[model samples]
Target: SFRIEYDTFGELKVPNDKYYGAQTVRSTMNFKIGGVTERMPTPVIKAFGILKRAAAEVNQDYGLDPKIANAIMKAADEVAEGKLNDHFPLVVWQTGSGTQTNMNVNEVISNRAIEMLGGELGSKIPVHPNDHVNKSQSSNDTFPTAMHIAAAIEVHEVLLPGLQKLHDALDAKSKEFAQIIKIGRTHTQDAVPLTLGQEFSGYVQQVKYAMTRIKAAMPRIYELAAGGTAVGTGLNTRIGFAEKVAAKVAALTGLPFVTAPNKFEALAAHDALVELSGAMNTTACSLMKIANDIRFLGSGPRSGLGELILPENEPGSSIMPGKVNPTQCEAMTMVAAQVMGNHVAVTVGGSNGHFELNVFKPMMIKNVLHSARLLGDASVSFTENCVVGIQANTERINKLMNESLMLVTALNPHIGYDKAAKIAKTAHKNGSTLKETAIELGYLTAEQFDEWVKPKDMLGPK
Candidate 1:
């Protein structure tokens, strides 16, 4: 049931069923911050696999034994494809450089490659974790390399597609509601009239810009730190190792990753990820307002501003029978809040990069990838469950607009601003319509009032 694995410190007893060696077991015993749920994100592990496979491939060209390199690459492929996820059990609370997790990957690849070539686990005979799997690499560069890979992939493959769906849904809704005019508010008081489509159009723009800002942050993230082994000097690493490994990784993942010109910035600072987090924070801000506005418009069926009819997904409350709530909007706003907070953690972590290396790598990547996953899932859910099913309450929109005293704005040009204000004040005070108030004030007759105040005519600049 147990076997001995040796590392720099000493030998440790590892479960025979697990592929991870000494360092991973030590990390598990030491960092008990959270359970399996807090394990370093699966994508990071997968990214490590990708990095290792590319390293092995590049190492072979640099005179690594081809036999061991092939076995290592095969095992690394399993890790990258998520076939070996169960072996990577370390938490995000490990060494700040993510060295333990890096070794976890290294050990898993080495042992699995050993098993593939019919060698003893932890024997280091067929494929030594350090000499072959992690050749010419340090956790300092590898961890950040994995960070950039995972971030770029998740944002490009997961987050952006979901955001595009959200943007398209909002854009479609804007067109669908274009003809439905409703009263506008400034300071939560009636101001003028605007089409419901125009309101949704604003949300479309917000989501569009969110996608743009996130895209703008990708080039920095695409730069890899693999070549800068211990420090930024590329010490011990071959002259062309960095560039070749980056090309290999780009080919494997289909993302354009280039070796960083200045590995110091790539390894010593995580500002690229922090900048991406800032973009996500801005997206969360945009989503919060959109969710709030949608819920506000869909507020109530009787006493609230029910201009937008939200879909009834489930019972809103235990006591309120037959009631439905804006649950999707609530979920989206909550996700937005979590992403905003995650950005703060990322900011602090990114800024704590002491001297030649950032020990905050694991925590920063954890927060960043978490934000990406949450936003991607939340945006898709919001679109499918809420925005797509939204219906306009035409009756309510027409009624609210017609009853609004702000319609007196239309009478401004003809009767003058002071007289128009007087009509509004008198109409509100007397609880009468604008036409009746204007006619009684001796400002205009019924026919004149009818000719002057037109809601449709006042819709756009004339």
Candidate 2:
């Protein structure tokens, strides 16, 4: 059930059913951390497929045989399309350079290419993994290039669109609740008055700003580290290979990937990914605040704030019958916390780049991609499950607003500040309305109180 394959180290038994060769098997045997839970991300593998196929196409232009190049392209296409994902079994805890996973892709493509050419697996007959498949490339350049590609694609394809949906939902909610005036709070105490729509507008702006920051980080991520093979010297790689391969990759994935201007910087550091992680961290912070606010606003149907009604998705308690909770908000809040933690790991990973290369790449990209995927999925889920279904408890809103002594703020100009303060204090002490207190204190008559204090008029600077 196993076939013999050899790398420079020695020979090993590879499962007959799998395409990966000796180096992959060795990695699996050595670094067993994170187990199956933290394998190399699929996006990186798919990026490798694009990178290798594009490299083969470009290498063919230089000197590689078309027969071998075409075979590699056909096989790499399967990897890119996720058909051969089961063969890539290495975990993130392996080599920081991601050399093992890179070779896993190389061996898979080479063996599959050999199979297509009527050669035995591990034969390296028509397509040698190093000579033909990984032609003109080193793991240093290829790994970071794949990191940028995966991060860019995830942000563009998943993160941005999900955040956009959330922004749009919040925008629609702002408009929908525009007329519902509610009491405002500052320092956890009632202050003035504002429309519920105005509060939702702040959330819309936060998401909009997050998308802007994420987009700003893309230019650096688009700059690929390809062609900086082996210490950024372009050694062993042919001239014009970097530019041409970058162009081909850009065309393949429809992303504006270009070769980095300074190969040394590209190889030595991963600040671009760190920058994207920082943006994602900020987005997580915003989402955390928004989720907590929503949950608190919707707290307790009878005993808590009850200003907003959240959709009941599941039972909140096993002991309390018919208890519903803000589960979606809770889930989103947890995702925010995870994204924040992932950003810290990415930052530390990015900072560990020694002289010629950053060995923390596997961990760095793993955390970055994880953050992007989580934030993207959570944003979409929160929008569909929580934000869109949010309803204003108008009766509670009006009751709280009407009883608020802060509405006495509207009488500041007519009654004077001291008298207005007295009215608020007396209203609280007597458990009476602002109008009643004002009239009882001989500060203003019923007509004057009615003319001066109005919640709607206190919404903005008057």
Candidate 3:
């Protein structure tokens, strides 16, 4: 028999030929089918470094055994410094219900910590996986804790800043086109005259509101489920561990992390994830509306809507030769669709809990993270490359504004409603200018017509 040695717990005998048969070892083999690496993105991994360091600080502060705490802290420092990142891989797909992932962290940290103590690889000398490194923790609590830390950091540090940049770009463009007049359409029919700036102003307001919504959602994310081991009852965890650990995490990560008010609900339900997903879905809906407008307005140089011009990126079609497509618009719409689909998946995952815990946690995290990243990246690209550079066809806008039958509104204060309606109807029927129709009907003097119907004057006080 061959012996496997652990630092804190010493040696255990095992068959040398089946060294990979343990639960953690088997998990590495079984969940390897997806081909997606288990390591988080670099920023997220760095965020985890903060989390590990925080956990070590908590253990030390709590008056725990110095040997165990020192070993765990040393390993965490190495991870924080980016060592042993390669051994941290766990497949995005797993069957041990995240237990394997937790153990992977524990085992890797313990083995590496032992090595720091001048012990051999795979030998748990001077530290052990379960007894020392994983002391007072479990996957049920730690995984959710790490999830919140990573997500909150990304949202505040990455997503929100990107959104603000896009918002600023739109605001600048809105100001740039503040003077151009266009015939506004409602229900695909001409309604009235308004400055194109007025339309763009609404876009700015939508982005402002989205920023507020994201800010409001951050507090919910900061509430963590850490120390709710096994089933939210905190079995095997030290008293006051949850709050202290959360405070330490907050201090280390520069986020406002707090222990969950209801540990039971946190462990048994995924409402936090659901809430975040809804916020992201709302943003996607807004992006979809904006993209659809861009595509429709910039439809064609010759045969389509032809109202606005977008940057030409590439030859739109392989066979159509001169055609250009709204590639940015296409990308935004696809990202929106994927976000909506991810919301559905999140809803299903939230609903699939079996009394005590949701087995669909991995799926939920995957979808939420995907939605956030896609929307964040796509919004940045669309705003920078497409929407910001858009130009209004001023000649077309002025012509439409000048000829619209709805310009009859300019006649309202002078001629009254019935006569104005009659003049508008006659203009539409005869394909004449509202001025001509009114003049022929003896409704107004040319001076009155010219002064009252000037597009700039009729829109209202600037």
Task: Name the best candidate (by TM-score).
Answer: 2
Error of 2 at 211 (Å): 0.3
Error of 2 at 23 (Å): 1.9
By TM-score: ranked, best first:
2, 1, 3
Cα deviation at 207, candidate 3, in Å, is 1.5
Q: Which ten residues in a row have the lowest lDDT in candidate 2?
A: 315-324
lDDT of 2 by residue, 1-462 (tens): 999987788889999999888888988999999789888999999989988999999998888999999999999999989999899989999888999888999999999999999999988888999989988899778899888989988998899999999999999999999999998889989877788899999999999999999999889899988899989989978889899999999999898999999999999999999999999999999999999999899887778788898887764676774345889999999999999999999999999899999899999999999999999999999999988999999998988876888777678788688989998898899999888788888988998877777776767663
CA RMSD of each candidate after superposition: 2.0, 1.8, 4.5
- Candidate 2 has what TM-score? 0.96
RMSD (CA, angstroms), candidate 2: 1.8
**Which pairs of residues collide in model 1?**
none
TM-scores of all candidate predictions against the true structure: 0.95, 0.96, 0.86
Q: Show model 1 residue runs off by greater than 4 Å.
A: 8-10, 316-322, 413-419, 439-450
TM-score of model 1 (CA atoms): 0.95
Count: clashes, candidate 2: 0
**Alpha carbon lDDT at 354, candidate 3:** 71
